[PDB]
Design a protein around this nucleic acid. Structure first.
Ligand SMILES: [Cl-]
Ligand SMILES: [Mg+2]
Ligand SMILES: [Mg+2]
Ligand code: NA
Length: 326
DNA sequence: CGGCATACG
DNA sequence: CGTAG
DNA sequence: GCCG
């Protein structure tokens, strides 16, 4: 088992679901406390289990696996022995975990804001609704739409959204293309937002495109919330039988020269991208982001025509999106 | 021990 | 500070 | 919390 998540296939569904879920609770709690290193280790250990070819049934099977030391191994041992891990259950039940989870799920609210509200005594969404003057316009939107944004998006919904985005993009710039990215591109049947990447085959033509796209979607009455720019974090009106619901949609524009890098980054998973960028820098001495891949010694950027190019540049076996579910 | 990804709005 | 993967 |  290789130590980096980008060196191994990780399917969406796997053989150690309960164990991985438990480790991800501890990772999430670590993030709520600002412990980014512990969050990363628990996330990585969880991801190792997702990559295994069969269920872990005994503690012995963890020996030699990367990112399993005394703490993560103890969690797995308790789950194997008793079906529950007392540490995990205490987190789940805790008022701090539950409230930080609720608050950070609000669009516009991060860990820092959630933690401040927690220390001020706030615990519920209606607590926040009762002092709306201390809310940003983005938080106001997130709170008004919170209930809809909590219900998953289906692949049917995505197809309908992609058609309306394509219509707007086509008027904004004929020839521009719309690619579904994010979790749906990794094979998810549901998601909590939809991600699209927009480019144009003629380099430079995409400059200034996103404002034109957003104006057209807004004129069509489809935009419930949004803020020169190249990423737009929107709330869209999605038709439903006899009504509609709010859906988070991210729109991103990239020049075609950067499109493989942007496609790679926006397809995720988050852990996969962090691991790929860590691998690039620490093992290959190259600097990776969603715009390109830089050689800091020759001071040159790699050209890529495909994601396959990027994996080859980094000396990694190619993984399709469905195997990037780290 | 230091390191832990790297952007944009 | 928020957002993204 | 774990790795190198
Ligand atoms: Cl930490
Ligand atoms: Mg997404
Ligand atoms: Mg998104
Ligand atoms: Na949030």
């Amino acid at each position: 088992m290789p130590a980096y998540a980008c060196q191994r296939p990780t399917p969406l569904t796997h053989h150690n679901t309960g164990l991985s879920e438990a480790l991800e609770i501890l990772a999430e709690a670590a993030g709520f406390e600002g412990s980014e290193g512990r969050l990363l280790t628990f996330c990585r250990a969880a991801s190792v289990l997702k990559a295994l070819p069969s269920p872990v049934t005994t503690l012995s099977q963890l020996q030699g696996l990367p990112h399993f030391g005394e703490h993560s191994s103890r969690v797995v041992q308790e789950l194997l022995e008793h079906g529950v891990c007392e540490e995990v259950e205490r987190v789940r039940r805790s008022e701090r975990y539950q409230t930080m989870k609720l608050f950070t799920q609000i669009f516009g609210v991060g860990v820092k804001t959630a933690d401040r509200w927690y220390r001020e005594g706030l615990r519920t969404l209606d607590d926040l609704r009762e002092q709306p003057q201390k809310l940003t316009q983005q938080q106001k939107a997130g709170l008004q739409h919170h209930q809809d944004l909590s219900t998953p998006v289906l692949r049917s919904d995505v197809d309908a959204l992609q058609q309306v985005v394509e219509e707007a993009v086509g008027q904004a710039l004929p020839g521009a293309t719309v690619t579904l990215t994010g979790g749906f591109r990794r094979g998810k049947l549901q998601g909590h937002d939809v991600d699209f990447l927009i480019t144009h085959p003629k380099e430079g033509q995409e400059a200034g495109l996103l404002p034109r796209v957003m104006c057209r979607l807004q004129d069509q009455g489809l935009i419930l919330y949004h803020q020169a720019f190249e990423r737009s974090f929107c709330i869209f009106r999605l038709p439903q039988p006899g009504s509609w619901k709010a859906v988070r949609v991210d729109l991103v524009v990239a020049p075609v020269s950067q499109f493989p890098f942007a496609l790679l980054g926006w397809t995720g998973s988050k852990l996969f991208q962090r691991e790929l960028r860590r691998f690039s820098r620490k093992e290959k001495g190259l600097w990776l982001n969603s715009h390109g891949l830089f050689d800091p010694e020759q001071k040159t950027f790699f050209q890529a025509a495909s994601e396959e190019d990027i994996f080859r540049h980094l000396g990694l076996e190619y993984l399709p999106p469905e195997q990037r579910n780290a």
